Write a protein that binds this ligand. Structure first.
Ligand SMILES: Cc1c[nH]nc1[C@H]1CCCN(c2ccc3ncnc(N)c3n2)C1
Ligand SMILES: Cc1c[nH]nc1[C@H]1CCCN(c2ccc3ncnc(N)c3n2)C1
Ligand SMILES: [Mg+2]
Ligand SMILES: [Mg+2]
Lengths: 282, 265
């Protein structure tokens, strides 16, 4: 029901990461100076329970380690009648997004063993949500963040359409498919699109008008990596993420036992190389 | 070249609270005059009385740049807010006629100069302190935006594999915008945007929910919302629609609005 005021517990600093996420802030735990991400929602009485929802979502399902964890929520009263402001507070991921990571890499491409590592983490996080019957619904490079520590965490899980390039065929509505059937395997598609984003600096169809991409995704065969340089194992993993008909798309668990994710011998060095890459740019 | 906006304009705040994005309310540091300032990280059509006038640009460098685009400031806020702030989420019928006419007047100007607004909706239709209606955000990206004011030809779909923008798409949006004024929401608002993108091309033309509206109003809606854009009238043709053409109470209307602008302010 009623919560608490943030004043003297948390503070904005503020504003991430260019408004791209909306009303989200770099914030700080006043007592310890620990950073944290902060969502600020203007509230009413019509929203009321959608809010009550957003919270139980995070509190329940944020406790894995591949998911940015819930911190707590706060009510920051506004002048009577006016709109109050809700403070959704979570773990802070200081090393930016995968989108950013690839952006900042010469030739905008990640090493295979990096892609393996990051994919696995995404899959571990997704596995956790799926086992709780939550569909993420918006896996793309931007919703996948690094910690200072090279830990991987998912955000923004559970009026605009926004960007379509990471969308699975089954979630775009058309005559064949008038009700857009989000299934848990939709996430896995987006995971495959994200791996390509890491491999190539951008999703398939990036060069197209988004309206056009939205039209094409359901009709094209599975996207493929442009280059032949990649390992068979990786070609195979992409092909698994991007089975056109989600009915035949492997489960999260099935993909976690995919050799490309499973057999990561050099992950030791990868986590190291990653931290280093972060710190330099840091 | 392009001045630095320091000493000339101060960003007072983000307008519509993020709604329009990185667009602020600025104030001239010396003169006090207000403007809208669209801020962009980077690498002669507005001087019609129904198009918010463009004041010019400033340059703020540099990497690790930001471009400033300055434009007249519209005090009374969007007509989306106006409807919101109107008891019963409905504007008065002759309020809608006057506003629609002003929309068409701006569009005509745009169209005569071969420009497609591309994004008519209650939010891109703004009011000055003095009850003047003015258009913003005309025909300037990775995000499919909000679908509800979108004309059918603009949506890529099974028989429209290549979306068509056409000056006539604006008139469809004008029609939806009038419904918004009537009911506070465009049709299918209750729908998930993805679902709405699917139905706009498929469904018959949307309609007012209420039977209380005048014949002329139903007709003007009907006129704007011709599904096939090839068979949809011009801006100029619609200006001649009785609903737009015959406004006796224009005077009372302007009055009634200026007032509201202050009252509900
Ligand atoms: C903050 C919040 C509270 N409830 N839901 C959220 C989401 C909003 C969408 C972006 N998500 C980010 C975006 C940027 C970020 N940057 C750093 N750390 C984060 N956790 C972070 N999270 C968090
Ligand atoms: C500022 C700008 C520069 N180039 N294009 C614009 C548009 C961005 C979309 C919103 N548009 C608004 C929104 C709210 C507003 N509020 C008051 N006055 C305005 N002119 C105004 N304009 C203006
Ligand atoms: Mg966790
Ligand atoms: Mg003007």
């Amino acid at each position: 029901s009623s919560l608490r005021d943030p004043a003297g517990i948390f503070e904005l600093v503020e504003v991430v990461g260019n408004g791209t996420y909306g009303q989200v802030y770099k914030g700080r735990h006043v007592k310890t100076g620990q950073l944290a991400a902060i969502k600020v929602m203007d509230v009413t009485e019509d929203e009321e329970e959608e809010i009550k929802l957003e919270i139980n979502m995070l509190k329940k399902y944020s406790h894995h380690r591949n998911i940015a964890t819930y911190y707590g929520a706060f009510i920051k009263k506004s002048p009577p009648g006016h709109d109050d402001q809700l403070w959704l507070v979570m773990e802070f991921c200081g090393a930016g997004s995968i989108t950013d990571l690839v952006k900042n890499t010469k030739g905008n491409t990640l090493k295979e063993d990096w892609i393996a590592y990051i994919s696995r983490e995404i899959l571990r996080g997704l596995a956790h949500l799926h086992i709780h019957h939550v569909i993420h619904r918006d896996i793309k490079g931007q919703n996948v963040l690094l910690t200072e520590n090279a830990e991987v965490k998912l955000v923004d899980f559970g009026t605009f359409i926004g960007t379509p390039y990471w969308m699975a065929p089954e979630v775009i509505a058309c005559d064949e498919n008038p009700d857009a059937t989000y299934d848990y395997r939709s996430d896995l598609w987006s995971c495959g699109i994200t791996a390509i984003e890491m491999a190539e600096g951008a999703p398939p169809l990036c060069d197209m008008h988004p309206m056009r991409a939205l039209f094409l995704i359901p009709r094209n065969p599975p996207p493929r990596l442009k280059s032949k340089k990649w390992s068979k194992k990786f070609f195979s993993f992409i092909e698994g993420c991007l089975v056109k008909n989600y009915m035949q798309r492997p489960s999260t668990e099935q993909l976690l036992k995919h050799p490309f994710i499973r057999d990561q011998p050099n992950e030791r060095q990868v986590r190291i190389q990653l931290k280093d890459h972060i710190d330099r740019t840091r």
